[PDB]
Design a protein around this nucleic acid. Structure first.
Ligand SMILES: [Mg+2]
Ligand SMILES: [Mg+2]
Ligand SMILES: [Mg+2]
Ligand SMILES: [Mg+2]
Ligand SMILES: [Mg+2]
Lengths: 152, 131, 151, 96, 188, 91, 63
RNA sequence: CUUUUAUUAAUAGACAGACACAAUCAGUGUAGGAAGGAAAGGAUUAAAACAGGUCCGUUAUGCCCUCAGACAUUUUGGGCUGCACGCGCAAUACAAUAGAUAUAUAAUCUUUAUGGGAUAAUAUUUUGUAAGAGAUAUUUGAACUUGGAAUUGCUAGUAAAUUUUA
């Protein structure tokens, strides 16, 4: 049968949902686009980070397909809105499916081997962040910014 | 739906020459000297834009399910200054895209909301032409 | 050998009794004259057919005569009437665009007729009060608020 | 037969559940439970009835809990339960 | 296959010649594009584990009209380093570490007192304070030389780091280090 | 009777030097000798850009763009890097 | 490269206390790596134990 | 009470727990963890004081004043917005780390006042019983090239910049 794992990794408002599947050619698809022709180079460079720290021999014959999302509530007609935030989401969720496939249908002693390498590389590639926008309080324009007062 | 496999700027750069050489389209009377919308400042610097925009709109209807006239104006909006106060978002002009929507139904590349089979075999030459 | 740049140019040109001059493009150098702005300067040259990216120092005198007729007679070359300043003017009733010497002489003549009629919106323009809905409490103290021209 | 529960406090909508789940599911027909997220009204208001002191604001609120049942049954099997399981503070508008 | 700088240069083949500064000089973090996303590295009392390339681009987005832009910083640093590579036939990272060392001030004075009777005393500088003072000097002469001139931002970065590393004294931060090392000497 | 301080509106006016004197003009046209001198010097120079040659031959930058474009139409130098900010001509 | 010959190499032992006009300077005990010595001197920036400090003059003293 | 990890969606999960730093109470450093030191941010809130503000919110009120072209109430126009001038809080700017155009890195232009938008004219038009009120086309295009003495806020997703509903 076709073995498939699906893992999610998310940020402040971004969502990522990869799917691993077994094919003879190593391929990575982001919105049905090959990754080598991506325009957002920051999204390309973070995937280029994980492709080199673990060997391409270990990632020999697998297929990954990646869909993105931004949660509702805000509407933006501007360009360049969700560039960095989505790139950290797909950097997180893609690294999840690698160790996911090696744990279920592969040998278990190889699973913790590459897991130690990336955790020595970055602990926060596999876990989400906590930092968000702090809410605004009254009496000022921002979170900690207070309005300028004057007495004379 | 293999339009994702190629870029966007090269898909327009080849297809716009044949969209000129078809010579089956009507054009507005003063499309050489006008603004594209009220949000824009000046006329475009390119000598041709009525054909290159028609190559650009064929990307979106091919990658999506259905494309109406109102959805076209929102993707080409502008952020213009209103003065000392901060800016505001405007939409594109509904009259220019109306003739653009009319020309492709006058040719026969699209019907009521989807595309025809005739424009599909045109695009399939183009993707193998670049690669 | 090399033709992307002209051999020699000229500096100062005399057109409609103003000194349009410089090694500027024909779109920017024609913006020196009042009555002609940056929208209408590009709009006239596309009808005459001279390219915008041509410096005005190198130009043929036969091309100059079309320029003198086009600005004088704008309805002949094929300009639509929406580009004019006096669209349906009160003094005449037909569409005409203003050029400097008739432009100032028409504007002040409109100001004199409001003095005899005592038009309260019009006479505040002459002394320099703000005719629109502005509030004059704490703004515009030393300045004047009439009609203003450069130099 | 879409039937809903709309309340103002949590404790009233809880005791109506285990009374209804034993009586309706185990006896005659099947059902579906569906809880909707809460809806909050916000009236930010200024505190003092004057414009003298330091200007402070207050936010008032009112919360509505929504739990809906989707049942398809025979005619009198649901309507006997309306007369039997009518609880005191809660509203239960039934749409047959 | 190892991580490279821009897939064109290498984090290796560079070395810090100064012994005192080499502890806080970091080379361990490798980035194809210098970007940080860890909460743990940020919230820390210590500043030893911070990438120098990450610290260098943060001195670019300086003024309030220009704050909040890392994309515009990453373009002009790429067009900078390619000119330094071909002109010198060196690793462009190698001229970078020689730029920090030479423009770094050695010792500075401290003013305690008030009025016409004011005591001046000459003290030394910690290596953590020497690095942070050196980066702030270099970005200032860049923003002065490229403010109202036809030099792009990519051009002014290149000849700044070449003149400061070569001790050619026509750069900005070497002239400013000249007087402050003189002031602390005569005050002693 | 602590402190009595008063200021005027005469202090808020700025003082500025009048003007800096005008500079002589650059050249905007190409000569036949200017055609020759750019091609011999560029073949010596490794990395060439727009501001570099106008700072040598006193040329404005608008006419220097075509002099770089005409040179790359010959097999002398080649554009080695291009972005939206700055293009780099090299060998 | 001529600025590299002026440095002398020395290692801090421990921190004593803070002293300054606003409490911005610190006093430290430092020994030379060339010869066995013990010096007390004020330094501006913040230090931890085990640092190596670059200094021009090695002969001046505190108190 | 809100956000965060999990899962039967209403329940778990953190305690300074662990090790080290000579005592109790503590404080600091490393390690595991979604979260480590009040987990992050709010809301509620002692005694007591001020001749602090509020009779122009009240069918809350004492005294005083006024009694039918009323010091009541209704209708039509004009005001609260005026113009020599001093002050406080704010929005755009003084430009290549930029502007116009665009396929948003296709390509091209401006290489110093094409930066900047006040003021004003002509023409089409929205709401309203009623426009010196809002919107559109073209033209006119001010000061302004980083600001004297002095002074306000700010320690992490904080300041700063750009967007977004009621
Ligand atoms: Mg009082
Ligand atoms: Mg009355
Ligand atoms: Mg009354
Ligand atoms: Mg505001
Ligand atoms: Mg402008």
């Amino acid at each position: 049968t076709i073995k498939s794992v699906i893992t999610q990794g998310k940020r402040k408002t971004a969502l990522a949902t990869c799917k691993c599947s077994e094919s003879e050619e190593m391929s990575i698809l982001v919105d049905k686009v090959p990754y080598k022709i991506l325009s957002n180079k920051l999204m390309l460079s973070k995937i280029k980070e994980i492709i080199c720290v673990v060997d391409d021999v270990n990632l020999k014959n697998l297929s990954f397909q990646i869909t993105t999302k931004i949660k509702e509530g805000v509407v933006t007609h501007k360009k360049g809105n969700g560039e960095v935030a989505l790139a950290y989401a797909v950097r997180m969720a893609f690294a999840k499916a690698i160790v996911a496939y090696y744990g279920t249908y592969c040998d278990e002693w190889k699973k913790q081997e590459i897991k130690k390498v990336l955790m020595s590389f970055d602990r926060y590639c596999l876990v989400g962040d906590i930092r968000k926008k702090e809410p605004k309080k009254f009496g000022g324009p921002g979170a900690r910014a207070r309005y300028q007062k004057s007495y004379r | 739906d293999e339009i994702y496999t190629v870029k966007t700027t090269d898909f327009v750069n080849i297809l716009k020459k044949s969209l000129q050489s078809n010579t089956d389209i009507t054009l507005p009377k003063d499309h050489d000297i006008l603004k594209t919308s009220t949000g824009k400042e000046n006329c475009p610097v390119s000598d041709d834009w009525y054909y290159a925009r028609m190559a650009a709109i064929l990307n979106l209807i091919a990658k999506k399910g259905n494309m109406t006239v109102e959805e076209a104006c929102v993707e080409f909006g502008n952020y213009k200054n209103r003065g000392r106060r901060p800016s505001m978002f405007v939409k594109a002009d509904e009259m220019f895209m109306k003739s653009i929507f009319e020309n492709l139904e006058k040719i026969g590349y699209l019907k009521e909301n989807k595309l025809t089979s005739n424009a599909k075999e045109i695009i399939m030459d183009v993707i193998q032409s670049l690669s | 050998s090399y033709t992307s740049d002209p051999q020699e140019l000229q500096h100062i040109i005399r057109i409609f009794n103003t000194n349009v001059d410089g090694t500027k493009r024909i779109a920017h150098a024609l913006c020196a004259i009042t009555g002609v702005g940056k929208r209408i300067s590009n709009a006239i040259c596309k009808r005459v057919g001279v390219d915008v990216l041509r410096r005005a120092g190198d130009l043929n005198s036969d091309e100059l005569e079309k320029i003198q007729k086009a600005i004088a007679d704008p309805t002949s070359v094929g300009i639509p009437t929406s580009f004019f300043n006096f669209k349906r003017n009160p003094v005449d009733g037909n569409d005409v665009h203003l050029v400097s010497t008739r432009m100032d002489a028409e504007y002040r003549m409109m100001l004199e007729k409001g003095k005899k009629m005592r038009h309260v919106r019009l006479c505040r323009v002459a002394c320099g009060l703000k005719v629109h809905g502005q509030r004059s409490k704490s703004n515009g103290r030393h300045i004047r608020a009439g009609m203003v021209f450069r130099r | 037969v879409h039937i809903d529960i709309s309340t103002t406090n949590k404790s009233a909508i809880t005791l109506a559940c285990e009374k209804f789940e034993a009586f309706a599911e185990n006896f005659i027909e099947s059902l579906e439970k569906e809880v909707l997220p809460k809806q909050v009204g916000l009236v930010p208001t200024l505190k003092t009835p004057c414009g003298q002191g330091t200007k402070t604001w207050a936010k008032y609120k009112i919360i509505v809990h929504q739990v809906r049942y989707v049942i398809t049954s025979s005619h009198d099997q649901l309507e006997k339960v309306i007369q039997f399981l009518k609880n005191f503070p809660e509203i239960n508008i039934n749409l047959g | 296959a190892d991580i490279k700088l821009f897939e064109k240069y290498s984090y290796d083949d560079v070395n810090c010649s100064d012994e005192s500064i080499s502890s806080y000089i970091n080379l361990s973090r490798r980035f194809i594009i210098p970007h940080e996303g860890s909460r743990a590295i940020i919230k820390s009392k210590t500043k030893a584990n911070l990438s120098i390339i990450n610290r260098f681009v943060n001195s670019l987005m300086r003024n309030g009209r220009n704050s909040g832009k890392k994309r515009l910083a990453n373009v002009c640093v790429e067009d900078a380093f390619v000119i330094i590579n071909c002109l010198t036939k060196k690793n462009p990272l190698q001229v970078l570490v020689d730029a920090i060392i030479n423009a770094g001030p050695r010792e500075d004075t401290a003013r305690v007192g008030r009025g016409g009777s004011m005591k001046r005393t000459a003290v030394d500088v910690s290596p953590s304070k020497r690095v942070s003072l050196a980066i702030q000097l270099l970005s200032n002469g860049i923003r002065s030389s490229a403010f109202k001139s036809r030099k792009s931002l990519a051009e002014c970065i290149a000849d700044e780091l070449n003149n400061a590393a070569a001790n050619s004294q026509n750069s900005y931060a070497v002239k400013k280090r000249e007087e402050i090392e003189r002031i602390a000497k005569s005050n002693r | 009777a602590l402190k009595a301080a008063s200021t005027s509106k005469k202090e808020k006016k700025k003082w500025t030097e009048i003007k800096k004197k005008d500079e002589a003009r650059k050249v905007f046209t190409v000569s036949d000798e200017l055609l020759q001198k750019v091609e011999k010097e560029v073949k010596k120079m490794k990395i060439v850009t727009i501001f570099s040659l106008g700072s040598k031959m006193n040329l404005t930058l608008s006419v220097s763009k075509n002099l770089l474009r005409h040179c790359v139409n010959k097999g002398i130098i080649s554009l080695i890097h291009k972005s939206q900010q700055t293009s780099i001509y090299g060998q | 490269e001529a600025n590299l010959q002026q440095q002398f190499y020395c290692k801090v032992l421990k921190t004593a206390d803070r002293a300054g006009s606003a409490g911005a300077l610190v006093l430290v005990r430092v020994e030379l790596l060339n010869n066995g010595r013990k010096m007390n001197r004020l330094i501006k920036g913040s230090v931890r134990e085990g640092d190596i400090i670059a200094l021009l003059e090695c002969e001046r003293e505190h108190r």
